Write a protein that binds this ligand. Sequence first.
Ligand code: HEC
Length: 93
Amino acid sequence: ADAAAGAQVFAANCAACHAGGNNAVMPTKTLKADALKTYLAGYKDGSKSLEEAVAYQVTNGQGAMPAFGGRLSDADIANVAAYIADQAENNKW
Ligand code: HEC
């Protein structure tokens, strides 16, 4: 999906909890490449790509992280997942 469009979704919906690619709530579980591969459901087990696993967790929530299905459009969810994947894979945080 469109990482550049996803940056705007991130600023509007994710930066209060994840400024800098970190995690204000659960500090280990950051948005950096190494942390994602260790802790993000589906991606950590190899059964999902990074981008799919991010999209799933944004849509459905996890733990203390709220769900965004019904709050964000399909394209916005897909695009923010692409932003996370691009930021992490290319070490841009
Ligand atoms: C604070 C109320 C949050 C908001 C809003 C968003 N996220 Fe979040 N996220 C939060 C927590 C507490 C956690 C950990 C969940 C758990 O217990 O495992 C997460 C996790 C993620 C992850 C995975 C990180 C990892 O496992 O290392 C991703 C990819 C993620 N969050 C993305 C994300 C996006 C894109 C958001 C805006 C749509 C978003 N989160 C909001 C807390 C909060």
